[PDB]
Amino acid sequence: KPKVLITRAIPENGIELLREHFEVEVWEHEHEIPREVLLEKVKDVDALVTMLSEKIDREVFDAAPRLRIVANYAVGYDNIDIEEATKRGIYVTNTPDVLTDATADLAWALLLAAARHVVKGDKFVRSGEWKRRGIAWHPKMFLGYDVYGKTIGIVGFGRIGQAIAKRAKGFGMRILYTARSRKPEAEKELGAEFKPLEELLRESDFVVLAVPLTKETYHMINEERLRLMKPTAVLVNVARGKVVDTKALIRALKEGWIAAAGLDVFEEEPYYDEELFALDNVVLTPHIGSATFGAREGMAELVAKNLIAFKNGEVPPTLVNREVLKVRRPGF
Amino acid sequence: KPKVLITRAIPENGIELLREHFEVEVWEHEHEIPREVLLEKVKDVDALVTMLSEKIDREVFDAAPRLRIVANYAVGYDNIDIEEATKRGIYVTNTPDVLTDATADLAWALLLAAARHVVKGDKFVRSGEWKRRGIAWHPKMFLGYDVYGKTIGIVGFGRIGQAIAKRAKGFGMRILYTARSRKPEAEKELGAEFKPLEELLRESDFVVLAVPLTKETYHMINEERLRLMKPTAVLVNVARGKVVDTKALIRALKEGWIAAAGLDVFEEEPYYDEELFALDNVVLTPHIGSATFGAREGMAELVAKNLIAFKNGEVPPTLVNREVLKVRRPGF
Ligand SMILES: NC(=O)c1ccc[n+]([C@@H]2O[C@H](COP(=O)([O-])OP(=O)(O)OC[C@H]3O[C@@H](n4cnc5c(N)ncnc54)[C@H](OP(=O)(O)O)[C@@H]3O)[C@@H](O)[C@H]2O)c1
Ligand SMILES: NC(=O)c1ccc[n+]([C@@H]2O[C@H](COP(=O)([O-])OP(=O)(O)OC[C@H]3O[C@@H](n4cnc5c(N)ncnc54)[C@H](OP(=O)(O)O)[C@@H]3O)[C@@H](O)[C@H]2O)c1
């Protein structure tokens, strides 16, 4: 009976389903499994369920001679060395689709919060500042940015990006996108227009990032790109922190190159930066894009389905490295 | 040349347009005009531009013998004694439409922030607590409520309510509404379904209030209605504070009768309440529904147009108390 290590307490639906087909060890602690502890525990396993926090690299593969499949509890897989996995006949799966709507909802929450000063406004009320000042209402108090009918620019036009666009249609927006290729069916269905990155940045009132982290997306939103954005524009990052040059973003926010930003993801996590966190025109969330009951349950069910399919000699439904099919047939 | 007092520093477009046709006094101070000061200044005026903060009642009318028209810098007019105005031949105008998109955007900002813990999350990051606890990401961290595909119940289905529904369509929602009359064109255009209030409250995952304050809407969201709502539901109030029984809402939030609330408006303003302000599951904004430059500019242009139309012997374009037309012809 094959052994699986699950590196965090995922929802019980997934754990229980895996227990029917695997011997299951779960890392029970809130904190990330320590690196030395991971390398010790993988020695014996046939499968892994990993979080974005575990770096599944050559060193891990060398420590886990029986390892045949890694199911990421995440749609991103920048934490896994995919090419090295393929070379070794190791299957890698992810969790697309089940978290699309949670992440797109969160991107929209950030867009609107940053646009209309929701965080600063809440503190203004909650701290008693509103009351202490004695002024109920003023025609110039807390003026923010219109969203309805404006232009949204979506960087990355896959599952999450297109979901962000569906919501934008409810807001009557002009929709621009960039991607590695045109998406002509999505253009027709969503009314979206393909643009080079730099033209998108120049024309957009709202820029939302929904790309994977790759060599090519690393620091794509740098100083030069931030300078192209409108001074009234709002930037939202629900992708990966390293897509943005944080030092450049801090200058942009402080000096008024852009109006505001909503950030769910950071170059190091958990993140603290005194300079960024002092700014009224940033809205911050602790990497909670996929944090709904429904999404996290669906993720758990999907990691389980992938490992069970593999055990049954089937191609896992959300296999990422399809080239591995030529290296080794599925199964333990 | 007729005299107008404008009780707040509204956008210059409106003030300047009025200066072409009226002798204009503007109350330019940060604080609202004191009651005793208002009663002194109205003695001499032919017209007023008022904010929601000024109570235009029998006492004001008795102090202002030349007063023929009051233009509220607001779509709401619960601060004006309309029946007494009509009896005296005084025309009352408001600012519909020009602020609809700002207010509906803000309602959506509140809905999403309350649903996904944006305010609480921001403080968790900004304070350094996220970093100090040392955990980047966890499958159970900050789980919130799915919005896409859920049911929204919109209480009041006029200009702002229908705008809230247009946005909901981008979120693929089932749309319920209640109002004093059925809206068959809106049903066809928006896919919205009419329900009695109590069925709407039972069936909705998100309830948004967009009614005026009247004798009938006063405390309509009371203990009984909050108990009918789902324990997972989110309530958003962009209407008037007095539509909700705040004491009952506090019990509902604390005891889990509903999940969360987003509030832009309160029974007293500015508002202070230690019990409500202690709650993680409320999101607060300081009555900033119409707070975009474009909304506020349009409001200013519209108050000016109303007073100028009246001066010209025309029916003002956003006259509220149309029965006054039988009492006195327009003009000074
Ligand atoms: N904040 C969170 O909690 C959270 C949650 C889930 C996901 N995420 C992040 O969101 C990412 C996207 O997920 P998804 O399901 O939408 O993935 P996806 O369907 O693969 O979409 C990614 C899109 O990015 C585009 N892209 C890739 N490299 C690009 C480049 N260099 N320039 C421009 N566009 C580029 C792709 O273009 P092509 O289609 O032309 O190849 C694709 O359209 C994940 O990889 C993850 O890092 C974050
Ligand atoms: N938070 C802010 O900054 C902000 C900004 C602007 C406005 N507001 C508030 O929002 C209100 C609505 O503005 P609007 O332009 O949408 O007005 P509206 O177009 O007159 O719409 C009001 C809707 O409420 C309905 N209604 C009235 N009494 C009701 C009751 N007892 N039960 C159920 N529905 C009832 C009306 O029914 P019928 O259609 O049958 O008449 C109508 O559908 C304003 O009056 C103001 O108080 C707040």
DSSP string, A134-171: T----TTTT-B---TT-EEEEE--SHHHHHHHHHHHHT
- Is position B193 annotated as part of the catalytic site? no
Resolution (A): 2.0
> Measured between beta carbons, which residues in chain A are less than 8 angstroms from residue B147?
101, 105
* Cα–Cα distance for residue pair A79/A75, rounded to 1 Å: 11
**Any atom of ligand 1 within 6 Å of the Cβ of A161:** yes
What is the phi-psi region of residue A186: left when phi exceeds 0, alpha when psi lies from -120 to 50, beta otherwise? alpha
Please, are residues A21 and A308 in contact by the beta-carbon 8 Å criterion?
Answer: yes
What are the structure tokens assigned to A191, written together?
């009314």
Counting from 1 in the atom list of ligand 1, the atom nearest the Cα of A181 is: 40
Please, are residues B210 and B155 in contact by the beta-carbon 8 Å criterion?
Answer: yes
What are the structure tokens assigned to A297, written together?
């349950």
> Measured between beta carbons, which residues in chain A are less than 8 angstroms from residue B116?
105-106, 109, 285, 288, 291-292
DSSP-derived letter for residue A218 is: T
What are the structure tokens assigned to A240, written together?
């990966």
* A-B contacts at Cβ under 8 angstroms: 243
In 3D, which of B95, B236, B229, B109 has the Cα closest to residue B167?
A: B109
Q: Do A139 and B104 touch (CB under 8 A)?
A: no
B210 CB near a chain A CB, below 8 Å? no
**Which residues are paired to B145 by β-bridges?**
none
> Measured between beta carbons, which residues in chain A are less than 8 angstroms from residue B159?
none
Q: Which residue is it, tokens 């607001």? A: B74
Q: In 3-state terms, what secondary structure has residue A228?
A: helix
Burial class (CB in 10 A: 0-12, 13-18, 19+), B229: buried
* Cα–Cα distance for residue pair A78/B138, rounded to 1 Å: 17
What are the structure tokens assigned to B320, written together?
């509220």
Amino acid at site A208:
V
**Strand ranges across the sheet with B69-72:** B23-26, B3-6, B47-50, B69-72, B91-93
* Cα–Cα distance for residue pair A309/A322, rounded to 1 Å: 15
Residues 6+ apart with CB under 8 A from B115: A105, A109, B144, B145, B147, B206, B234, B260
Cis peptide leading into B270, omega within 30 of 0? yes
Method by which this entry was solved: X-ray
Please, are residues B314 and B69 in contact by the beta-carbon 8 Å criterion?
Answer: no
Residues 6+ apart with CB under 8 A from A188: none
In 3D, which of B52, B28, B113, B88 has the Cα closest to residue B283?
A: B113
Chain A's closest residue to B291, CA to CA, is A143
Domains and CATH numbers, chain A: 1-96+290-332 (3.40.50.720), 97-289 (3.40.50.720)
B28 CB near a chain A CB, below 8 Å? no
What are the structure tokens assigned to B260, written together?
């969360």
Would you give the distance in Å from CA B323 to the centre of its chain?
25
**Strand ranges across the sheet with A192-194:** A192-194, A174-178, A151-155, A206-209, A234-237, A260-263, A282-284
Q: In 3-state terms, what secondary structure has residue A213?
A: coil
Which residues between 308 and 327 in chain B have a beta carbon less than 8 angstroms from any beta carbon of chain A? none
DSSP-derived letter for residue A32 is: P
